[PDB]
Design a protein around this ligand. Sequence first.
Ligand SMILES: OC[C@H]1O[C@@](CO)(O[C@H]2O[C@H](CO)[C@@H](O)[C@H](O)[C@H]2O)[C@@H](O)[C@@H]1O
Ligand SMILES: Nc1cccc2nsnc12
Ligand SMILES: Nc1cccc2nsnc12
Lengths: 144, 140
Amino acid sequence: SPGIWQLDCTHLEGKVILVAVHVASGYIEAEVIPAETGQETAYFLLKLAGRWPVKTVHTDNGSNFTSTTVKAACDWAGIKQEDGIPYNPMNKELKKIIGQVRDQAEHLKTAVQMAVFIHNHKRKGGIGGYSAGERIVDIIATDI
Amino acid sequence: SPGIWQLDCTHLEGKVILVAVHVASGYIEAEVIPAETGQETAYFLLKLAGRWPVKTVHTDNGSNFTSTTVKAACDWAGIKQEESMNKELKKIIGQVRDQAEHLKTAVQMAVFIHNHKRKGGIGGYSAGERIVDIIATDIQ
Ligand SMILES: OC[C@H]1O[C@@](CO)(O[C@H]2O[C@H](CO)[C@@H](O)[C@H](O)[C@H]2O)[C@@H](O)[C@@H]1O
Ligand SMILES: Nc1cccc2nsnc12
Ligand SMILES: Nc1cccc2nsnc12
């Protein structure tokens, strides 16, 4: 469970936003990519696996994940890819925040990173609670 | 401090790699960009700050760090602007550069290897373990 991420795509303004959610914390990483190809998807997974200890990804089983490049990436990084496993702990939420910052950014992808910043820093559960960024480091830390 | 990063660039096969090192842990994030621009730097910093608690970035004097889009991004994200890993990362990049068609793939394989690599014997830690242990400790 600390090694499990759910990957999902969302489309806005004709563009593709690939999102990785750390299931146990709600923490997200995201990128805007030109189309859902094997190469972009593999590169996105490789980057994520280099930044956090990714043991398992649940995907929507879209055709980008059935590509050979994506399989080679997961094997190289030691990720187990589980296609078609539902999200059970977000795209609605990211879009609402993107709407709150959209008029401050000349380009969508800047707005998407602003929204990821706001999501990951936001304290959940009233004033004594913790943000998704706080939660992920507390769950992953091995030697506190 | 847990919030202190150092950023810089390195040049290879005609491309620019932007590297950020979390100074207290040695953990890195890196991206290959077409050219070292103000827009690319700004976007890089915003991504970094959404992913980790970034207070201060130490940079070189380049005009890409001082553009008005970089200042807007830093004001918005709360970032205040003001060694060897460039050289270590480079080393690893050559070590795997053949397992990959594209430079940007080899760069991210190198980031992966660097962040996962246990330093010392049994009892040691990787850079990824140090940064999470540092921040988690700071949070309590
Ligand atoms: O969204 C494009 C944006 O991302 C950057 C990295 O900072 O480009 C890299 O990451 C993208 C998302 O994974 C990839 O599509 C791209 O191929 C990769 O180089 C920026 O340079 C770019 O503006
Ligand atoms: N990664 C993190 C740790 C502690 C707080 C944070 N806010 S955003 N990312 C965070
Ligand atoms: N962010 C991280 C925490 C623990 C181990 C890791 N390896 S790569 N990034 C990591």
